[PDB]
Design a protein around this ligand. Structure first.
Ligand SMILES: [Zn+2]
Length: 272
């Protein structure tokens, strides 16, 4: 059946899961920008060595398609850890045009205010979108193998539960386009770091393909952690799109051999 992320009029995929209908949520594709060479053309990342003018114009292009001004975006450092920070209108603009002013040392953000667009960069790692429609909360986390080993997904649920007094049953999640087991192979150190994060009897999100080599499914790993954290199975939507496989739409750190652009994952609510 249809992927939860479907292409819109311009260069971006909207999250089609029902629980997200009340927000502006999606992932950009690589087309429609000003960037050149390995970054062609809609590179949204300011920290990958691309021309800054080109990247800021690409972000202005998206702000235009979304009718959500760049001055209202909030970005974070993305250090491949599991920390998350709550943001408000007072953080608007952080890391929007200058990477150095991004929220430091975290890999996830959440807000319960409208008019704030959470914006994170990806090119293979897992983008995890969160929403509590009733309470008006939205969240976004960046999960590579290190952040997943650190439990970033469950940490978001924990924070919403303990600090925002939201029940896991009131949370919905969408796991967007990322590299699949079809293209992502890792060794024992990687999978060993994930083991402790899953329930004792849980099915493993990997498959040994050769002695010491594993086809890893990070999307599934995060899905299992979210289930354990209390998020209902039917509230979790998962994209089947692989960033490495779908070269016509995405930049891929692995497929492009380390030098490439970044798509922007975003989520926010329009301020009347
Ligand atoms: Zn693939």
């Amino acid at each position: 059946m249809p992927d939860i992320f479907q292409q819109e009029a311009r260069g971006w995929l909207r999250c089609g899961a029902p629980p997200f209908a009340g927000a502006v949520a999606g992932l950009t594709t690589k087309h429609g920008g000003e960037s050149k060479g390995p970054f062609a053309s809609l590179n949204m990342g300011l920290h990958v060595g691309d021309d800054r003018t080109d990247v800021v114009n690409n972000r202005r292009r998206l702000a235009e398609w979304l009718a959500f001004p760049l001055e209202r975006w909030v970005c974070c450092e993305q250090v491949h850890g599991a920390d998350i920070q709550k943001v408000t209108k007072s953080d608007r603009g952080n890391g929007a045009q200058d990477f150095a002013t991004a929220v430091p040392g975290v890999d996830g953000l959440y807000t319960d205010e409208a008019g704030v667009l959470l914006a994170l960069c990806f090119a293979d790692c897992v983008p995890i979108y969160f929403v509590a429609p009733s309470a008006g909360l939205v969240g976004l986390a960046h999960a590579g193998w290190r952040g997943t080993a650190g439990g970033i997904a469950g940490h978001m649920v924990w924070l919403w539960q303990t600090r925002e007094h939201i029940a896991p049953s009131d949370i919905y999640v969408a796991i967007g386009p990322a590299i699949g087991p079809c293209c992502y192979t890792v060794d024992d150190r990687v999978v060993d770091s994930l083991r402790p994060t899953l329930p004792p009897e849980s099915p493993l999100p990997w498959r040994e393909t050769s002695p010491g080599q594993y086809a890893l499914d990070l999307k599934e790993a995060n899905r299992l952690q979210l289930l354990a954290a209390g998020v209902p199975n039917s509230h979790i939507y998962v994209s089947e799109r692989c960033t490495s496989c779908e070269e016509a739409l995405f930049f891929s750190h692995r497929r492009d051999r380390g030098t490439t652009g970044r798509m922007l994952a975003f989520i926010g609510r329009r301020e009347e």
